A paper describes a structure:
The retinoblastoma tumor suppressor (Rb) is a multifunctional protein that primarily regulates the cell cycle but also has roles in cellular differentiation, DNA damage response, and apoptosis. Essential functions of Rb occur through its pocket domain, which is necessary for regulating binding interactions with E2F transcription factors and transcription repressors that bind via an LxCxE motif. The pocket domain is the most highly conserved region of the multidomain protein, as well as the most frequent site of mutations. Protein X-ray crystallography of four missense variants reveals how mutations destabilize the protein fold and inhibit E2FTD or LxCxE binding.
Residue numbers in the entry: 383 to 437, 440 to 499, 512 to 576, 600 to 611, 642 to 784
Amino acid sequence: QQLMMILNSASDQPSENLISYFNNCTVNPKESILKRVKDIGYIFKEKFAKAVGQGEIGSQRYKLGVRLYYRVMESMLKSEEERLSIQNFSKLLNDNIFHMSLLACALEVVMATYSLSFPWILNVLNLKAFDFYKVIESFIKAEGNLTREMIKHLERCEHRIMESLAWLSDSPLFDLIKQSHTAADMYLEPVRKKSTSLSLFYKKVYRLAYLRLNTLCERLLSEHPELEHIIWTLFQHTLQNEYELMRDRHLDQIMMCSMYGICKVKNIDLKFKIIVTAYKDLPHAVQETFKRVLIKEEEYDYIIVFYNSVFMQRLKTNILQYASTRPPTLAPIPH
């Protein structure tokens, strides 16, 4: 409530100190930014009411998002003023996706505060999950007054993107994989040089996925504490080189298939039900991630089907190496 107070007692328009930043720009963004806000209010209020029904509360919801947005932007620009050139500073304040993403993050903070949850706001504004992800950490770092709970909600939005949404078909993420650390750096990347967006994203994916396997292996593989490290390499080599297997799927599905897979090739019998059972106890686990996965185009099925009919058909050649006289070398633990 400490933040919602300044938002409820603050102005509807950009501050004088923020107007300075606008005045220090080669191309001045003042008019592009506000018209952008005005236009977007309309798509937000329409799509809002068409979800709760009739009575218009959305206008008040949007106006607080707009106040948070202008506040967070000012805070963000104050550090980017030393980091960015005169020309990068202006390329940023004129970049639309950066702005959409920032405003979307403001709007989600209020929506979630007033518990249509994420990822509603992305589709409302037609914003790709991978673009929105680029703003979150710097958004947190730029709003000192976020509640513990608000921070925690945003980090959960970040993690849903990394686990599934950025892997949806049409995600620019795949463009970036084929082509081959702040929000402003990541939005200033030119469309077409090693990409900072993909590299940070992957450094964080690996750290997240591994935290989830490590919990899952301590409970179920106390008898094979050496197997944990062997499983991560299959998981990591999968994500790096066989990335297509995540298209429209969930990080946790590739995890579970790997730990079952290695224990099969090591002649360690542990059936899928014993792990799918252990997986549910994870904080935000949901049973459909293992109850319905993709087998064939526009087809859904149980998880063991995916393991037998999708996972091995690409990776059978790579897995048997794990038991030969020449087993593949183990992957570095993400720091």
